Amino acid sequence: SGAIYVGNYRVVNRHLATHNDWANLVWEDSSRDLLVSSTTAQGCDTIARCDCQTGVYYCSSRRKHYPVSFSKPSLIFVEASEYYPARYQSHLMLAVGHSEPGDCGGILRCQHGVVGIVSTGGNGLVGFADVRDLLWLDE
Numbered sequence: 001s002g003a004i005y006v007g008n009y010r011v012v013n014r015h016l017a018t019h020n021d022w023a024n025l026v027w028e029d030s031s032r033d034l035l036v037s038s039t040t041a042q043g044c045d046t047i048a049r050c051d052c053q054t055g056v057y058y059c060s061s062r063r064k065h066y067p068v069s070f071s072k073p074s075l076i077f078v079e080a081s082e083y084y085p086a087r088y089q090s091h092l093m094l095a096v097g098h099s100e101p102g103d104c105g106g107i108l109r110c111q112h113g114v115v116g117i118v119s120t121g122g123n124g125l126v127g128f129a130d131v132r133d134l135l136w137l138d139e
């Protein structure tokens with residue numbers, strides 16, 4: 001689990017969104033596994049606006065932050081899970097790192113701010129949904 005709190009927005013994995021998220025919806029995209037809802041309180045996270053390929057992510061199944069190298073956002077084939085059939089997921093970045101299903105939502109960040117959130121994984125890989133192209137999160 002986990003979210004990004006920027007301005008009056010909450011960014012979560014679409015497959016983990018709550019009823020309150022759906023009832024206060026701003027934007028969602030199943031191909032990216034992202035959903036954004038509105039918040040009453042202002043958040044403290046800032047979004048990175050860069051092309052970094054190195055950063056650090058939070059892994060809840062280890063209680064640890066790990067440094068990683070990650071690919072550029074791309075269209076990647078992801079195996080079937082309990083939330084989606086096997087399909088192509090867009091704007092996804094891959095790295096070598098530990099992950100488990102409940103690690104979705106952990107933040108990936110670089111020197112500039114939040115880059116994305118954990119969205120996929122398996123066998124020593126972790127995948128992150130990028131948010132750096134969503135410029136509207138800043139206004």
Ligand SMILES: CSc1ccccc1CC(=O)N1CCC[C@H](O)C1
Binds near residue numbers: 083103
């Ligand atoms: C951190 S995810 C993970 C990690 C290790 C092993 C398996 C997973 C689960 C996963 O990849 N899922 C979960 C739901 C939505 C995704 O498209 C598919």
Ligand SMILES: [Zn+2]
Binds near residue numbers: 048049051052111
């Ligand atoms: Zn950066």
